[PDB]
Amino acid sequence: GPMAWASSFDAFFKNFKRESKIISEYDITLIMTYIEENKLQKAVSVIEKVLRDIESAPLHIAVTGETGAGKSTFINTLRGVGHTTMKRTPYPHPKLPNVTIWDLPGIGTTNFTPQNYLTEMKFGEYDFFIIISATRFKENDAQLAKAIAQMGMNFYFVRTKIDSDEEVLKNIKDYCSNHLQESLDSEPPVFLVSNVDISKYDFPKLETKLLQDLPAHKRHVFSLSLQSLTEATINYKRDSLKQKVFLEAMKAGMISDILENLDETFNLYRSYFGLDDASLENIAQDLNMSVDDFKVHLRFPHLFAESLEDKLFKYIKHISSVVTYYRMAYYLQNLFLDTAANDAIALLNSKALFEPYISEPPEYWEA
């Protein structure tokens, strides 16, 4: 009953990295206590509210520094795009409407003190600041960082690196910031980021830190904002989506019918992982084959083809083992999310992997 529901709620969220949890440790213990006290309406009301804040979370990121190719590329990276100003300029995310990346002019190109620069750029609107440079950070930049901390807000230093398509990283950091820990006195990190490959240098560490520092309810929309170009960014999306459908199942209490209603949800999920038709049709042409003949080696198109009801029956018993059960819609969504994430990971090395499926199976499904 309620006690087993509560203990199954607790065990589920222990399987996820700290920085990817879409609800706080406080809200977890809260929902547990209410369920244990059998205040079931109160618990559902809390879960509903949590889901409300996750789905409507705005994300406003201020990117401040000198103009140039590296800065524009990083702003596009935060919009999920792979391509003498004195005003800030908004750049809305093309796929998430609640997300806006702001281009702020470098403080050195204005006549503003740190405090007046921040009020001119309406600092209270943002979730955090990225202070970005292509060369070396100046005393200017360190005093702006100091002024942001004194507002009670977060900043991160990003140095962009021109690339073509270890020792380089250590040398660039000695060049770009050997005077930062003088002006600031706590030691701030610098994140080196490649202008071509988000897998390189410090960008994986940056996504992890930004997630860790954000409020729990904003982690979902941030994890979705980045393009599915590395195993790390795919898995942050996978784990965040899996938590969300579990919360939906917790608040809620003919497989072909259920599948047909999830059809729009399944297409949303495909777009998150880069498996929309257009993305797949493009990979198929680079491989010189029918897109229909391409998808034969992906697991997600034939996932719901031993009869399906028996496979699902056995799937549900594995997911239940470390009993609490949920609606069939929860298990189908969870299964589809693991299958699509695995297919997107395999396509990161598409052509070398054809040498019947190129992806790993979703756990507990085909065994």
Residue numbers in the entry: -1 to 81, 94 to 175, 190 to 277, 287 to 338, 343 to 359, 367 to 399, 404 to 415
From the paper:
The atomic structures of mouse Irgb6 monomer were solved in two states—with GTP and without nucleotide (nucleotide free: NF)—at 1.5 and 2.0 Å resolution, respectively. The NF structure did not have any nucleotide or ion in the pocket (NF Irgb6). The G1/P-loop (GxxxxGKS) in the GTP-bound state recognizes α- and β-phosphates of GTP, whereas that in the NF state override the corresponding binding site of the α- and β-phosphates, kicking the GDP out from the nucleotide-binding pocket of Irgb6. The G4 and following helices αd and H4 change their conformation largely from the NF state. The G-domain of NF Irgb6 exhibits a similar conformation to the NF form of Irga6, although the helix H4 and surrounding structures assume different conformations. This difference can be explained by the increased flexibility of G4 because of the absence of nucleotide, which is further stabilized by a neighboring molecule in the crystal packing environment. The helix H4 was stabilized by the interactions with the neighboring molecule. The αF-αGa loop was not visualized in the NF Irgb6 because of its high flexibility, whereas it was well defined in the GTP-bound Irgb6. The Irgb6 structures in two distinct nucleotide states take on similar conformations with overall root-mean square deviation (RMSD) of 2.4 Å. From the NF state to the GTP-bound state observed here, the conformational change of switch I pushes the αE toward the helical domains, generating rotational changes in the N- and C-domains.
The p47 immunity-related GTPase (IRG) Irgb6 plays a pioneering role in host defense against Toxoplasma gondii infection. Irgb6 is recruited to the parasitophorous vacuole membrane (PVM) formed by T. gondii and disrupts it. The overall architectures of Irgb6 are similar to previously solved Irga6 or Irgb10 structures. They consist of an N-terminal helical domain (N-domain; amino acids 1–55; αA-αC) (purple in Fig 1A), a GTPase domain (G-domain; amino acids 56–239; H1-H5, αd, S1-S6) (green in Fig 1A), and a C-terminal helical domain (C-domain; amino acids 255–415; αF-αL) (pink in Fig 1A). The membrane-binding interface of Irgb6 assumes a unique conformation, composed of N- and C-terminal helical regions forming a phospholipid binding site.
